[PDB]
Design a protein around this nucleic acid. Structure first.
Ligand SMILES: Nc1ncnc2c1ncn2[C@@]12C[C@H](O)[C@@H](COP(=O)(O)OP(=O)(O)OP(=O)(O)O)[C@@H]1C2
Ligand SMILES: [Ca+2]
Ligand SMILES: [Ca+2]
Ligand SMILES: [Ca+2]
Length: 376
DNA sequence: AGGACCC
DNA sequence: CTGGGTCCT
């Protein structure tokens, strides 16, 4: 029937993890730097012009007093990421990750259990925790309203637990599907939560200013819709189903058009241990086989540290970039799957390397990544 | 092995 | 010159 989903979204995640490590950064404007980029900054610096993924020189040209911290190494953020997911998994076991700082949790069964605990007395004392989207009025006789309020109380417990137990703040959105939870969780930022009652749903989706803002509609699909005279959510709502299939495929079409009406029936899928783990690095230039081999050696070494834990990988891939992506994989021989070990691994990779780049020709590499997948 | 998508 | 991830085709 009607679900109750929460979407949890950590405030300035990398910045926030750095500030926890020393508050000498907190209260001071702060950017987290990767290569020539500040990828994220604290709010104490966001109001001073600093934007996410902003060029590091333009970031100084709007704030020369910002503290820069190098967050090229994801290790600490990743460990924090799973601590968050695991805490949420305590509430209900089916938690879906999206990147390092977002989780969906299906609160439906939990919402039911709590209501069954209540008497017909306390069913009228129930209150909302956090903002109601659009200041819509609650109607306690509306059983959908009552379930969504209970969901907002659970969302508040989640947020409180994350803070008491891990020191992290985040936003939460409670709604009836995954699309809507995610759209509404950002209505009040940072460190706040908002709940979407059913009658405000159209208000929510029409609140958007371009189709590119609908999660599921990425870089290419946007540029495609934009080339059919489709700019607004309503343009996509009202556009012809038949034509739309012809440019995107009956799959993309019928899904994104449904999204345009705030409709999303995709289940919250339990993420669990990952399906892959890699190590990446980019650079301005790399046109040798010795340079490449050396970079590749570092990536494998860090990867190998992570390769312990839960279980073992039975495939390896190598990714390069030109001047887009090009990969080459192959499986990892039996005896190799026992944890030197670098030596034959480096050989596999370099053979994979040579397979895809002419090592006696000019070649200009701007990225290198080593991936372990197919985990058993 | 590449496509799209996500943060 | 971001450092990671997911599923589908
Ligand atoms: N292409 C990218 N788009 C969005 N985020 C990206 C992209 N590439 C790298 N990232 C990040 C930027 C941030 O450091 C990190 C997450 O950024 P978020 O958009 O989730 O938001 P945030 O936690 O930094 O702050 P906030 O928007 O306040 O919640 C992720 C690696
Ligand atoms: Ca976000
Ligand atoms: Ca975030
Ligand atoms: Ca989008």
């Amino acid at each position: 029937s009607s679900r109750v989903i929460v979407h949890v979204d950590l405030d300035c995640f990398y910045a926030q993890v750095e500030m926890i490590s020393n508050p000498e950064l907190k209260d001071k404007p702060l950017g987290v730097q990767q290569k020539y980029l500040v990828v994220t900054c604290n709010y104490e610096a966001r109001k001073l012009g600093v934007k996410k993924l902003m060029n590091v020189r333009d970031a100084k040209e709007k704030c020369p007093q910002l503290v820069l911290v190098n967050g090229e190494d994801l290790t600490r953020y990743r460990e924090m990421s799973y601590k968050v997911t695991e805490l949420l998994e305590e509430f209900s076991p089916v938690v879906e990750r999206l990147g390092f700082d977002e989780n969906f949790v299906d609160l439906t069964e939990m919402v039911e259990k709590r209501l069954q605990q209540l008497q017909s007395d306390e069913l009228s004392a129930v209150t909302v925790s956090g903002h109601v989207y659009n200041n819509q009025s609650i109607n306690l006789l509306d059983v959908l309203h009552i379930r969504l309020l209970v969901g907002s109380q659970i969302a508040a417990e989640m947020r409180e637990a994350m803070y008491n137990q891990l020191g992290l703040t985040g936003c939460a959105g409670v709604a009836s599907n995954k699309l809507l939870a995610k759209l509404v969780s950002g209505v009040f930022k940072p460190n706040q939560q908002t709940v979407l009652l059913p009658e405000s749903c159209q208000h929510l989706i029409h609140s958007l200013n371009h189709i590119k803002e609908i999660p599921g509609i990425g870089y290419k699909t946007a540029k495609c819709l934009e080339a059919l005279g489709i700019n607004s959510v309503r343009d996509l709502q009202t556009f012809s189903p038949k034509i739309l299939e012809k440019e995107l495929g009956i799959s993309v079409a019928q899904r994104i058009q449904k999204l345009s009406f705030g409709e999303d029936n995709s289940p919250v899928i339990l993420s669990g241990p990952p399906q892959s783990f890699s190590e990446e690095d980019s650079f301005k230039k790399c046109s040798s086989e010795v340079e490449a081999k050396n970079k590749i050696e570092e990536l494998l070494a860090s990867l190998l540290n992570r390769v312990c834990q839960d279980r073992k990988p039975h495939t390896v891939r190598l990714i390069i970039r030109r001047y887009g992506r090009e990969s080459r994989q192959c499986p990892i021989p039996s005896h190799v799957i026992q944890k030197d070990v670098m030596t034959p691994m480096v050989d596999i990779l370099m053979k994979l390397f040579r397979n895809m780049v002419n090592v006696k020709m000019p070649f200009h590499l701007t990225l290198l990544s080593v991936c372990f997948c197919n985990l058993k």
